[PDB]
Design a binder for this molecule. Structure first.
Ligand code: NA
Ligand code: NA
Ligand code: NA
Lengths: 539, 539
């Protein structure tokens, strides 16, 4: 079977798996589930979720517990159990950095600062974050990563593993960069030529060329180079797609580097990362912001002509499930909720307060919309036109409930109108537009009041000028002409509910009458529709 | 197999069973379950609880219903059923005293006051409490107890019965001592030499040597001698460990002897009991105080270089389960909740209002932490260093809930701070300290607010200078250096979850990342951890 690969063309992207575009409908384990005995607490969640791909760590400490006495016994069991369940894997290389720190590096690495040095603050104190200028550290990480890739080259010829994350949330908290003498010598030197050329900049030292951003851009550059080298060495063994995942700064109100993880692929240093690390396939956001506006901004910033969108981690609380829709609508190649296992941990406040079947079911319900068309959707996303939206108001707060109640009757009616309007989205589909609304009956035209909790969304793919594939969730989708018709009228020509079997459309039933008089109304159950529209003459 | 025995060395203790230290994770029946037909209502509770030892009465009235005519049919059945279930037994000899009174003595004893005399009050009235100076009573009790011990010598060679309680809550309510002419004659006489020598006192009569404490100390001494003689006679037949259990006085606010049970092993007469009864292995508190401060004080007073801690009875309501932790932390040899059977009785207000699976489960959940390491814990407790803590605030009262709500915003914030601080415990583990906190998320650092109801605790054993065995319940445990290091930093080197198999540690998984970033967080599920800490140079 051909290698998985990330294709980029015409500002669009596809993750090719087994020779065709693929969507990762993912689940990711908690951080301590990377052992054979823990897998029994991972698989059942995956099954309940309907996930097709598991993201799970492989730690440097476990594969090289003594230097270089390699142990791949976890990987062996993981591959075999994944294959039995017919799912794919994304392995997460937890090594020099995991959330800025070396906790998953072997004891012989993390306890030997002389050989493998830490970031030194400007005031001389040391942080528990390994410096990207540590040459021994790079060589050692690289060597172990190579051994892992050799294991996959020899033992995973059908590519059960489809992608590898290199490190996990790199960077440093508590300082902007390494200020050690070793780092200071490089910082005081000339900015490397290659970076100067790629950005279109005048030569100089770091402070001269970057000014107020020199410290942060320096750290980003050095980390990016470190990760790029590890990536190249591993890809020389087996050329799987590889990516890095970002501990995000708030895109609207980031604060200072060091408060956020400095040097990772934050939105202000994507240009540094892309210039410095041409061998890393994509830079993936880890999304734990709950609110629609911030999440939407993150999806906008990380979807670029030079960057495929992969939501490598997202919170597992209920409000996060609907972000699958805009993720896919942007041409995203995947989506992977974090902490989908029963190993007795909840990362609340970041995710769900409790982990049970209801937690899983919020994601299972949205994955059920995509699974039955996964390959067809992936192709259309890469080659054609897709759209995707989520319910754009967050669930009403207790503070907002109080303020709501204390309001004048005129103000309450105005608020309802404001909410209805905010809960109405327009999509321009060429000759036709769609209007998506949330939280209303399936009959008549009473205005939308939203779902409680906020949960809805819709996916649309264009099949032809007048024909669309549509599936949605707790929402109404209504079609209309995109431009004035000139003495023509319009209608729905035909709505079919069905499925793809061996790549061919099979009709189950025609929606008509009540089911198409008031838009196309979706609840929590999965329905995949082919909608054909027509303008017609009445002259 | 070798006889069970209580060892005492270097101010520490162990209950040896089958040649190694043992922890009684007990259950005790209600008072009327000591019959073959009642056992079907006892065993299922034991199984649901995960108890390893059953405490159950054997009554003088049932073994010698007619003088001279012994009946061990109950004991026969009990032994056989216990063996089938692979549990051990502690038999409770209910004889001359059961809660101060002779109700479990045969009719031919308790109805013959001439032969077997009662305590006489100073005013000449009689109380239903047998005088410890009644020589016929002592001889008769002793004779029956000897027959019981003969039955065990001949019919329990593998020591299904590991310990015997001699009497049950001895003493007298309603008077301080016996004031009968017979007792008055002894009280007026010289204090016995042996007691004078052992306490380091000047000879004299009771009033002269003890003053204001003479009446109470006299009753304690006489009862202690009576119980010691019974104990010696039984041990001459089979030398099992034997103990007495105490109807406690409130250690902070006891009131007067006679209001509490005068003459039992209350905290003010332990010195009398130890001097008078050298053959009784230990003196065990019966704990029905609900509140942390009082329970903690009782555990402190009963844990002594000359007294192994055994919580021979404790209430079976929810708040009591967490006291297993400090019991074991003090080097306790056992813990036995009272009334764990379904014989249609609740001793509420002393225990739980209702008896059902939930009542049992509160104890099952904490026994599940200890059972998998029972032998390893018992050894470490005897030979090494252990610690144990329980959540130190009791559940918030309705009165405190009202007061909390009516409070000013500044006062509410101060109260939360005060509670957080009270819900934070420090333990000095040598080179490392642990901080235990209760009722907080498993991620980030928001301050502890306590569990509702109060329920948490933690056990720690030292394996080496930098390595500890840890298990806890509804709590967070965080490690730090015990002393400022000098230009060194520190981290967790490794946390392994696992179990002991044939006395050897088997690793199941490594806790890392999220699972160790914010201390070690436990819910209601059992996890046994080996925690290795490291200081490291950054010079
Ligand atoms: Na248009
Ligand atoms: Na210390
Ligand atoms: Na200290």
């Amino acid at each position: 079977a051909p290698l998985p690969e990330l294709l980029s063309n015409n500002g669009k992207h596809a993750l090719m798996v087994d020779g065709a575009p693929y969507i990762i409908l993912g689940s990711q384990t908690n951080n301590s589930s990377n052992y054979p005995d823990a897998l029994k607490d991972v698989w059942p969640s995956m099954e309940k979720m309907g996930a097709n791909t598991l993201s799970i760590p492989v730690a440097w400490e476990q594969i090289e517990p003594v230097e270089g006495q390699f142990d791949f016994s976890f990987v062996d069991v993981l591959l075999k159990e994944a294959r039995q369940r017919k799912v794919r894997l994304v392995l997460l290389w937890f090594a020099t950095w995991k959330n800025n720190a070396p906790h998953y590096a072997p004891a012989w690495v993390k306890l030997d600062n002389a050989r493998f040095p830490r970031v030194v603050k400007e005031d001389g104190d040391t942080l528990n974050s390994l410096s990207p200028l540590g040459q021994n550290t790079l060589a050692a990480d690289k060597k172990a990563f190579v051994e892992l890739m050799k294991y996959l080259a020899k033992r995973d010829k059908d590519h059960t593993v489809i992608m590898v994350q290199v490190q996990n949330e790199v960077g440093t908290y508590g300082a902007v960069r390494d200020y050690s003498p070793m780092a200071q010598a490089v910082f005081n030197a000339a900015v490397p030529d290659d970076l100067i050329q790629k950005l279109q900049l005048k030569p100089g030292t770091w402070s001269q060329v970057f000014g107020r951003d020199a410290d942060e851009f320096f750290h980003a550059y050095q980390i990016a180079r470190y990760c790029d080298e590890v990536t190249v060495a591993g890809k020389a063994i087996k050329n799987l797609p590889m990516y890095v995942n970002v501990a995000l700064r708030n895109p609207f109100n980031p604060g200072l580097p060091g408060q956020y993880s400095s040097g990772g692929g934050t939105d202000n240093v994507l240009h540094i990362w892309k210039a410095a690390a041409p061998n890393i396939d994509l830079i993936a956001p880890d999304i734990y912001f709950r609110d629609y506006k911030t999440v939407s901004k993150v999806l906008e910033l990380y979807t670029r002509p030079d960057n495929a969108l992969f939501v490598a981690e997202i919170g597992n609380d209920q409000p996060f499930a609907r972000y699958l829709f805009p993720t896919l609508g942007k041409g995203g190649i995947g989506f992977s909720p974090f902490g989908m296992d029963d190993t007795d941990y909840t990362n609340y406040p970041l995710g769900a307060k409790v982990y049970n079947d209801e937690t899983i079911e919020q994601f299972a319900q949205v994955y059920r919309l995509v699974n039955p068309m996964m390959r067809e959707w992936a192709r259309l996303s890469y080659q054609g036109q897709v759209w995707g939206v989520a319910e754009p108001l967050d669930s009403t707060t207790e503070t907002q409930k109080i303020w709501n109640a204390e309001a004048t009757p005129e103000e309450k009616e105005q608020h309802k109108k404001d909410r209805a309007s905010a809960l109405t989205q327009q999509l321009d589909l060429g000759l036709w537009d769609a209007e998506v609304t949330y939280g209303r009956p399936m009959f008549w035209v009473t205005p939308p009041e939203g779902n409680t909790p906020a949960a809805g969304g819709a996916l649309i793919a264009q099949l032809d000028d007048n024909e669309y594939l549509v599936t949605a969730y707790k929402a109404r989708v209504e079609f209309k002409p995109s431009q004035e018709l000139a003495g023509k009228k319009f209608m729905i020509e035909r709505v079919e509910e069905g499925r793809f079997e061996k790549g061919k459309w099979v009709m189950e039933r025609v929606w008509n009458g009540d089911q198409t008089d008031w838009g196309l109304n979706f609840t929590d159950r999965p329905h995949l529709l082919r909608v054909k529209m027509a303008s017609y003459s009445v002259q």
